[PDB]
Amino acid sequence: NKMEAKIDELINNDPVWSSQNESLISKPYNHILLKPGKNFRLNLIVQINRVMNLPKDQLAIVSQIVELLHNSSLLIDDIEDNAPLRRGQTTSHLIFGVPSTINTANYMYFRAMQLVSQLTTKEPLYHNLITIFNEELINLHRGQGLDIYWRDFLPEIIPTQEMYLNMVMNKTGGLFRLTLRLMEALSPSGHSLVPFINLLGIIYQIRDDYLNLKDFQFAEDITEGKLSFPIVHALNFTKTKGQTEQHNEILRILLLRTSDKDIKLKLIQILEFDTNSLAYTKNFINQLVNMIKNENKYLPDELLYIIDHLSEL
Amino acid sequence: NKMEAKIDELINNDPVWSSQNESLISKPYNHILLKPGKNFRLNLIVQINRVMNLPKDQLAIVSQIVELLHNSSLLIDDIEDNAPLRRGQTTSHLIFGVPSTINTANYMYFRAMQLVSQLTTKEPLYHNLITIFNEELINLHRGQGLDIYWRDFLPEIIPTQEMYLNMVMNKTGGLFRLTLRLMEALSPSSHSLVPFINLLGIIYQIRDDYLNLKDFQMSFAEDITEGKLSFPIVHALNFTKTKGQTEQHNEILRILLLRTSDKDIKLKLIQILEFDTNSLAYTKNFINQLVNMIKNDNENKYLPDELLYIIDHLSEL
Ligand SMILES: CCCCCCCCCCCC[P+](C)(C)CC(P(=O)(O)O)P(=O)(O)O
Ligand SMILES: CCCCCCCCCCCC[P+](C)(C)CC(P(=O)(O)O)P(=O)(O)O
Ligand SMILES: [Mg+2]
Ligand SMILES: [Mg+2]
Incomplete structure (x- = not known):
């Protein structure tokens, strides 16, 4: 009757969870916290x-939600990309293992x-x-799913520039739009800034x-075989111009998942001198950036600062 | 100009997503749909x-929710346990890869x-x-996290029976409680069945x-290969500790730590649990006592018949 009695108490109560348990499962998360970038976000x-x-109280909570989602998304991203480093340090899954890191990242969503x-408190x-929150997390996963599928099943699908951009609107635009949309819906206070945040x-x-x-020119995107913007331009450029051998070598090097620096450098120089994808990309970026520097259709000083430190987000 | 006009169109519209894109992302999930279990749930x-x-329409939605969370947690669980088979069939991550499978499972959440x-549509x-939904998904992750921590940090912490039970309340009670609490909240009808669902x-x-x-023992025993702190193992490790059977205690740990697929080594651990700690019988008995708590609930303390068939086929869930 004492087993039954204790089982009785167990099931008539909320599940037990200690602050000690909480700390143990937060390990993968606490480790990525030590990485910089918070202040720029x-x-x-x-x-x-x-x-x-x-x-400021409300903004602090938006900031916390954003940090939880971003850090969790990165823990999962490095597992999905098998990344050994993130901002100069060891990636969490290599320390605490893939199983704990997946669960903690997901716990944090x-x-x-x-x-x-x-x-x-307002219900509507x-x-x-x-x-x-739901829509943009759905968007992030759609974009992330496409990115991974293209990479892992290459050469089943060679995305065009148009497909890449739609994937990015989902994969990267997700968190930018989530944050901005929460702020605009909470604003006590011009046109929506979504177009602008998508461009960012x-x-x-x-x-x-x-x-x-x-x-x-560690070009870790080559090791991952990522269909990056420069790579998508080179794969399409080579198909288009009939450079059969180059098209095939690009695919062959991506499929190697190699860490050999010279092989990586051979690929980068193919995009440099053979397809001109690096120059194409640099110019594509300058053009998007000029779309803001040049009205007030997208925009509503600090802006320019943010753009030059975009990489640190 | 033309480049900019195209970019303007892109950023002023919602993100482009096609049904063909939806199909690509759904492959790891449709694969687990082929495995049995739906009818019993x-x-x-x-x-x-x-x-x-x-x-019935509302009920169908609750059902679809349960199916998405359940299959998705299984896809993730098989990745976290490095399992090769689920219901006799190859696991999805071995076919579509761990990257795609993690992402698809999280997408379904x-x-x-x-x-x-x-x-x-009632806002309250x-x-x-x-x-x-939020609370039980959190419970589910806490319980899975603790289960994984003990397994992966073994032998840092050896849980007791009490700790194991609290872990299961989070890990396994989560979906049972989530499903029941949604139904109790939507009931257009006038005691809660949560205590009952927890025992289930x-x-x-x-x-x-x-x-x-x-x-x-009667014919994979993957839990051993995984190093899982399962209920019989929790009993074996604590029994050996308590009775000072130092070498038995350590032998259980060494077999768990081997992450072995060797049938003979696995049989050896089962021999320890059967002839030394009598953990399998202790377990059979523990389960029967839990089941009797329902079978002998005449005053309807837990019950609100077919429950019998359900409880005996609980393993098809
Ligand atoms: C208006 C507020 C904006 C807040 C912005 C918060 C930071 C957004 C970061 C966007 C990260 C894009 P991510 C995770 C998809 C880049 C990855 P991937 O491998 O997916 O390309 P990585 O290159 O860092 O590995
Ligand atoms: C109120 C009706 C509810 C119907 C749906 C009930 C679904 C119960 C699912 C139970 C899944 C337990 P799980 C995912 C924690 C077991 C795993 P684990 O490795 O985590 O112990 P496994 O042994 O199947 O791999
Ligand atoms: Mg990445
Ligand atoms: Mg499992």
Whole structure:
């Protein structure tokens, strides 16, 4: 009767969970916290709030949700990309293992979800906030799913520039739009800034793809076999011009998942001198950036600063 | 000009997503749909609805929510346990790769979240439904996290029976409680069945841990290969500790730490549990006692018949 009695108590109570348990499963998350970038994400949010005017308490919660989602998305991204390093340090899954890291990252999506209820007591607003949360997380996964599928099943699908851009609108635009949409729905306070934030997302991703190869010229995107903006331009350029051998060598090198520096450098120089994809990309970025530097259709000083430090987000 | 006009069009529109894109991303998930289990879950839901009486359309949505969360957690669980088989069939991550499978499973969590808003348009009740969904998904992750921590940090922490039970309340009770609490909140009808559903979850997890070792002793025993701190193993490790059988205690740990697929080495651990700690019998008995708590609930403390068939086929869930 004492087993039954204890089983009785167990099932008539909420599940037990200690602060000790909480710390043990937060390990992969606490480790990525030590990586920099927080202050640049906060700066962007603050500058945007000069337009939305959320009371600092509310802005702090938006900031927390955003940090939880971004950090979790990165923990998962490095597992999906088998990345050994993130901002100069060891990637969490290599320390605590893929199983704990997946679970913690996913746990943190739900903690982020929970914070949304701290933003307002108004029930209709709450529903809109959760819908915004739900929609953009759905968008992030769609884009991420395409990116991974193209890479892991290459050469089944060779995406065009148009397909890449739609994938980025989902994959990268997701968090930019989530943050901005939450702020605009909460604003006590011009046209919507979504177009502008999408453009920031697209510049962010292509620059990320570009710098990954240009700072090397560890070109880790080549090791991952990522269909990056420069790679998509080169694969299409070579098909188009009938450079059969080059098209095939690009695919062959991506499929190797190699860490050999010279092989990576051979590929980068093919995009440099043979397809001119690096110059094409650099110019594509300058053009998107000029779309803001040149009205007030997209925009509502600090902006230019943000754009030059976009890479640090 | 032309480049900019194209970019303007892109950023002023919602993100482009096609049904063909939807199909690509759904492949790891449709693969697990081919495995059996759906009918038994729907039956438990239909039976529970004789008490809740949700209109059928609402009930179908609850069912779809349960199917998305359930299959998705299994896709992730197989990745986290490095499992090669699920219901006799190859696991999805071995076919579509771990990257795609993680992403698709997480995508379905959010598709399920979206179905919740289609259970009602009443803003108050809606908030409650989302709170229920959020709370149990959090419980589910806490429990899975603890289960994984013990397994991966072994031998840092050896859980007791009490700790194992609290872990299961989070890990396995999560989906049982999520499904029941949504139904109780939508009931257009006038005691809660949560205590009952929690006991179902516990019986389910201990029988699952029990059968993993008993089906191998009577004929894979993957839990051993995985190093899982399963209910029989928790009993064996604590029994050996308590009775000072130092070498037995350590031999169990060494076999778990080997992450072995060797049939003979696995049989050796089962021999320890059967002849030394009598853990399989202790387990069989523990499960029967839990089941009797329901079978002998005449005063309807837990019950609100077909429950019998359900409880005996609990392993098809
Ligand atoms: C208006 C507020 C904006 C807040 C912005 C928060 C930071 C957004 C970061 C966007 C990260 C894009 P990500 C995770 C898809 C780039 C990855 P991937 O491998 O997916 O391309 P990586 O290049 O860093 O590995
Ligand atoms: C109120 C009706 C509810 C119907 C749906 C019930 C679904 C119960 C699912 C139970 C899944 C337990 P799980 C995913 C934690 C078991 C795993 P694990 O490795 O985590 O123990 P496994 O043994 O199947 O791999
Ligand atoms: Mg990445
Ligand atoms: Mg498992």
